[PDB]
Amino acid sequence: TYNQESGLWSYIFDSSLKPSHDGKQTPVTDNMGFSVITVSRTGIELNQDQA
Amino acid sequence: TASSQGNNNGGGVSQTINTITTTGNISEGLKEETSIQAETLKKFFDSK
Amino acid sequence: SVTTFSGLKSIAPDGFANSIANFSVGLKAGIDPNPVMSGKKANYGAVVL
């Protein structure tokens, strides 16, 4: 998602998406939980002042 | 004559193109370091 | 014995066995809320992982 007030992107990872089994057919057991990565802009952006 | 076609009436409003601080920046077509300035501006225009 | 693909060692932390094939996901655009000088139009970018 992007939020126009914050000017910030939210990246949602859901570990329920992991497959049931490995390439060695071993049950996958770290399939619980999730994580958020927040992206912001850095640097001098276009059209602040004449420069 | 009427072979020009289009609108028979069609009077109304006209507006100039949109603009931003980048509009009219041609800095890659300006200056030189290999050739003559018109030719690098010609390369810069051909893709645009 | 120069290292090649059949012998390259992965320590890849990002959920991939392999450490040679790039990947990318979730391209998203957004308008900067930060004012721009008047008579210039609002800024926008995108990002992708």
UniProtKB/Swiss-Prot annotation, chain B:
It comes from the Bacteria. It is found in: Cell membrane. Belongs to the adhesin P1 family. The protein is the major adhesin mediating the attachment of this mycoplasma to the ciliated epithelium. This is Adhesin P1. It comes from Mycoplasma genitalium (strain ATCC 33530 / DSM 19775 / NCTC 10195 / G37) (Mycoplasmoides genitalium). The chain holds residues 1157 to 1204 of 1444 of the full protein.
Swiss-Prot record, chain C:
It is found in: Cell membrane. Disruption phenotype: Probably essential, it was not disrupted in a global transposon mutagenesis study. Disulfide bonds: none annotated. This is Mgp-operon protein 3. It comes from Mycoplasma genitalium (strain ATCC 33530 / DSM 19775 / NCTC 10195 / G37).
